[PDB]
Amino acid sequence: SGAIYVGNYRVVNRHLATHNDWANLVWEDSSRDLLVSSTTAQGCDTIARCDCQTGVYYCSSRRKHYPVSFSKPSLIFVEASEYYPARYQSHLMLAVGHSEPGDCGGILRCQHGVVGIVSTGGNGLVGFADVRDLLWLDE
Numbered sequence: 001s002g003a004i005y006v007g008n009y010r011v012v013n014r015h016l017a018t019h020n021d022w023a024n025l026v027w028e029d030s031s032r033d034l035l036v037s038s039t040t041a042q043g044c045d046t047i048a049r050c051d052c053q054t055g056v057y058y059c060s061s062r063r064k065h066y067p068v069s070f071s072k073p074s075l076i077f078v079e080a081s082e083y084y085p086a087r088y089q090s091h092l093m094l095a096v097g098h099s100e101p102g103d104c105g106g107i108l109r110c111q112h113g114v115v116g117i118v119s120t121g122g123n124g125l126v127g128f129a130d131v132r133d134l135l136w137l138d139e
């Protein structure tokens with residue numbers, strides 16, 4: 001679990017979305033595993049506008065923050081699961097680091113702010129759903 005709260009938006013994994021999120025849908029994308037919904041309260045997370053390749057992510061399965069070197073956003077194949085069939089997930093960034101299924105939603109941050117959220121993982125790797133390109137989150 002985990003979400004990004006910027007202004008009047010809530011950014012979560014599309015596969016972990018709730019009824020409120022779908023009843024107040026702004027935008028959703030299965031290939032990115034992102035869903036953005038409406039909120040009345042004014043969130044304060046700063047989204048990064050950058051091309052950083054080093055950051056810090058939160059791992060709830062270890063109760064720790066970890067520094068990671070991560071890849072550039074790309075179409076990386078994700079094996080079929082209970083939420084999605086086998087496919088390439090766009091805007092995904094990989095890193096060598098610990099990851100477990102309940103880790104989805106954990107924030108990734110650099111000096112510029114929020115980069116993305118834990119979306120995939122396994123075999124000693126962790127994948128992040130990038131949000132730096134969603135310029136409408138601030139406006």
Ligand SMILES: CSc1ccc(C2CC2)cc1CC(=O)N1CCC[C@H](C(N)=O)C1
Pocket residue numbers: 015033078081083084089099100101102103104118119120121122123
């Ligand atoms: C941090 S999630 C994770 C971590 C470790 C593992 C274990 C080492 C295998 C597996 C996973 C699950 C996984 O990657 N997905 C299931 C939920 C939907 C995700 C998607 N965005 O398509 C894909």
Ligand SMILES: [Zn+2]
Pocket residue numbers: 048049050051052110111112113
């Ligand atoms: Zn940055």
